[PDB]
Amino acid sequence: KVNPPQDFEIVDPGYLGYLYLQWQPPLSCTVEYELKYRNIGSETWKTIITKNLHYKDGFDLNKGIEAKIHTLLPWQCTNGSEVQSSWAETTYWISPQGIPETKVQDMDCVYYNWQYLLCSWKPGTNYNLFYWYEGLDHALQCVDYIKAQNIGCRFPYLEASDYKDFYICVNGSIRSSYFTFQLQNIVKPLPPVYLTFTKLKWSIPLGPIPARCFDYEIEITATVENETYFVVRSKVNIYCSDDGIWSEWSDK
Amino acid sequence: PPSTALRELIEELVNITQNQKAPLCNGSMVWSINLTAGMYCAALESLINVSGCSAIEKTQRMLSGFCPHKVSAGQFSSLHVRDTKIEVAQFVKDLLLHLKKLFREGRFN
Ligand SMILES: *[C@@H]1O[C@H](CO)[C@@H](O)[C@H](O)[C@H]1NC(C)=O
Numbered sequence: 001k002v003n004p005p006q007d008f009e010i011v012d013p014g015y016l017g018y019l020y021l022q023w024q025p026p027l028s029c030t031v032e033y034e035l036k037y038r039n040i041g042s043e044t045w046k047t048i049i050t051k052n053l054h055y056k057d058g059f060d061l062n063k064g065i066e067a068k069i070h071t072l073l074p075w076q077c078t079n080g081s082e083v084q085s086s087w088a089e090t091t092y093w094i095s096p097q098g099i100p101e102t103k104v105q106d107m108d109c110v111y112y113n114w115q116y117l118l119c120s121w122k123p124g125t126n127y128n129l130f131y132w133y134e135g136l137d138h139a140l141q142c143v144d145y146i147k148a149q150n151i152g153c154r155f156p157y158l159e160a161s162d163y164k165d166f167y168i169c170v171n172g173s174i175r176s177s178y179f180t181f182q183l184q185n186i187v188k189p190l191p192p193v194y195l196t197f198t199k200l201k202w203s204i205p206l207g208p209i210p211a212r213c214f215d216y217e218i219e220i221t222a223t224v225e226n227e228t229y230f231v232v233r234s235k236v237n238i239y240c241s242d243d244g245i246w247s248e249w250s251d252k
Numbered sequence: 253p254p255s256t257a258l259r260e261l262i263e264e265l266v267n268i269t270q271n272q273k274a275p276l277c278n279g280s281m282v283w284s285i286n287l288t289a290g291m292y293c294a295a296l297e298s299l300i301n302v303s304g305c306s307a308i309e310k311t312q313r314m315l316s317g318f319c320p321h322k323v324s325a326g327q328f329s330s331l332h333v334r335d336t337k338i339e340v341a342q343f344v345k346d347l348l349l350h351l352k353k354l355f356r357e358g359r360f361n
């Protein structure tokens with residue numbers, strides 16, 4: 001037999017959804033820990049086995065988190081069968097303040113031309129937006145808001161921000177809203193430019209976006225990944241992102 | 253072209269990641285890799301251990317050509333970070349994602 005890990009705890013560094021789970025070795029080769037966890041409301045458990053005394057991941061802070069772990073002994077240790085300990089359990093869940101529906105609504109974001117992030121929402125006193133992603137020492141607040149009270153945010157330059165979880169919390173003073181997504185998936189590019197006839201051509205809009213990352217749509221409707229074969233529209237393709245917004249159409 | 257290798261590997265990972273009705277590779281666990289330089293090999297050194305899963309046959313074949321050297325199960329040169337295993341279906345989502353990143357960054361090997 002073996003005992004479960006000690007001090008099983010979920011820690012919030014305050015990164016707006018990025019959480020640590022921690023534990024100390026149990027009492028009494030190499031030792032393993034099987035950690036399961038999930039957001040309460042999910043029917044499936046995220047699973048992992050580690051020799052470390054901690055694990056980290058992004059969670060829905062709108063919801064509660066529950067986790068279970070159990071020491072795991074390899075049969076080399078035993079020199080017999082595989083011994084395992086009982087589940088240790090912990091939970092963590094943001095003390096909800098204010099009455100929900102005091103939580104802001106219609107939250108919408110776009111990463112215009114993979115360059116400038118905009119976030120917008122309707123209310124239900126004033127609102128604040130914070131964000132974070134790995135790299136950042138701590139969660140930052142928006143500077144250039146969009147007033148009308150704050151109902152928007154226009155982000156600074158987000159260096160090294162794509163292809164990793166992006167966290168947002170909308171405080172108030174009441175119920176905070178939490179949002180997570182990855183920038184590459186939320187890009188509305190600029191319409192293609194310099195359309196010419198010669199099979200007809202056109203070229204890449206002005207942006208940081210490479211050409212390989214583009215899918216073109218053409219309503220003269222049709223879809224293509226080359227730039228040849230009138231009006232054309234664009235969108236980031238699935239070699240660069242998972243989802244995407246179509247650019248506006250070009251001129252005839 | 254030069255990106256063709258990457259292009260088609262990504263397609264594959266996208267396939268077995270939308271086309272996994274039941275848990276991918278019977279929910280088998282594999283060593284997680286540090287997703288950075290010399291990781292094509294780390295990725296193969298990891299998955300190579302999943303024997304009996306055909307759903308990942310292609311993927312592994314494709315990987316072998318990205319990796320200068322041949323890789324055998326139980327062999328860990330490139331895989332230095334070997335202190336955590338994750339389910340295969342997460343491994344490929346994580347891998348898949350990192351690939352898309354390299355593609356966007358125009359990095360093809
Ligand atoms: C709201 O959340 C931000 C980001 O987590 C935090 O820094 C701040 O302490 C909170 N502010 C209020 C007014 O609750």
Ligand SMILES: [Ca+2]
Pocket residue numbers: 057058
């Ligand atoms: Ca995650």
